[PDB]
């Protein structure tokens, strides 16, 4: 955002929307891949507490750790705290989830992760 003459130089997704509080416009401009754009947005949002420092935002981009209540987690662990198998979020077996893939598509709902 700062260093006004940045909009004439080429840019770095990391030298605009990472090491600096950025516009989703410059984010949109730099991303275009609107799926990953939503991903980066989701990042930003969850990383709202990971805005600083820089390496914290880098880790929040890695996504292996759940931020706060766990909106950002994108790992491969699909097991409950006590070893019970996780039911498919979209499937109705054995429970029909009021809160499921249709209601939360932006969390990247995997098989049972």
């Amino acid at each position: 955002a700062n260093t006004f003459l940045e909009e004439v130089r080429k840019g770095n997704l990391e030298r605009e929307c990472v090491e600096e509080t950025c516009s989703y416009e410059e984010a949109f401009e730099a991303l275009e891949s609107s799926t990953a754009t939503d991903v980066f947005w989701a990042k930003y949002t969850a990383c709202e507490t990971a805005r600083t420092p820089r390496d914290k935002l880098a880790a929040c981009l890695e996504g292996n750790c759940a931020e706060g209540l766990g909106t950002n987690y994108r790992g491969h662990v699909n097991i409950t705290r006590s070893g019970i198998e996780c039911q498919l979020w979209r499937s109705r077996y054995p429970h029909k989830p009021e809160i499921n893939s249709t209601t939360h598509p932006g969390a990247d709902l995997q098989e049972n992760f």
Binding site: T21, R51, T52, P53
Partner: protein, 48 residues
Amino acid sequence: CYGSYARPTNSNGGQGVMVEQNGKLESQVEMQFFSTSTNATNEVNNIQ
């Protein structure tokens, strides 16, 4: 800035309104500090 003047008051060329208070020795000049807002605007640590 274009065309602005302020006559010297001190000996070695330092401007500043030397007011008088029990003697013109007094010459008030204050200091103000600043740090980076976006340091994080949030530092449990005492900001420098």
